Symmetry: C2
Subunit: 99 residues, 2 copies
C-alpha cells in the first residue's frame, strides 16, 4: 500500500542535495560536467560568467557531494561524482519545459 | 535550454527540497491520496500537510481532482517522482 518514510536523516540529506542543485548556474554546470570533465576556465568560457562566480558555485556543489576535482597534468578538472545526479537536473528541465 | 527553463527548473527543485515534501511525493508516486491518507502515512498534523500541499500545487508539483466523495492529490507527472527517488538513492550513501 503506502511506503516507508526513510529516516529523518535520509530525508534531510535528500533535501540538501536538491537545494544544492537548485540554481540556474549549478544546473548549467552539472549539464557541462555530464558531457566532459572541465577546468574552471572552460566553464567560464562556456557559461559566460566570471570566474569568482563559477568558483563559488563549484564550492557549493563540492560541499554537497555533487562534484569533485582532481589534478590532470597542469590543470585541476572538475567532474560529477555520480552521473545519475545529472538525471535529477535533466528531469527538472523536462518538467519545466512541459509547462 | 533557455534562461527561463533553467530558472523554472531551479524553482521546482527548491520547492521539492523540504523533507515533508519529499515524503509527500514518495506517497503520491504509488497512488493518488486524499489528505487524510497522507496525514496517516506521514504522522503529521492535518493543517501542516495541507500547507505543504497548497505550496506543492502552486509550484506545479501536485494537482487535486474530485473522485466521488473525495478530493484526491496526484503528482503532475513521473519526472517528479524520479527526481525524488534519485535524490533518496544518493542520500542513502553514508
Amino acid at each position: 500500500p503506502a511506503p516507508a518514510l526513510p529516516s529523518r536523516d535520509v530525508l534531510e540529506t535528500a533535501g540538501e542535495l536538491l537545494r544544492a542543485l537548485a540554481a540556474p548556474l549549478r544546473i548549467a554546470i552539472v549539464l557541462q560536467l555530464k558531457q566532459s570533465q572541465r577546468c574552471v576556465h572552460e566553464l567560464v568560457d562556456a557559461l559566460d560568467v566570471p570566474q569568482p562566480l563559477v568558483s563559488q558555485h563549484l564550492r557549493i556543489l563540492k560541499q554537497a557531494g555533487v562534484v569533485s576535482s582532481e589534478r590532470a597534468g597542469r590543470e585541476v578538472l572538475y567532474r560529477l561524482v555520480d552521473h545519475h545526479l545529472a538525471h535529477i537536473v535533466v528531469d527538472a528541465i523536462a518538467h519545466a519545459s512541459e509547462d
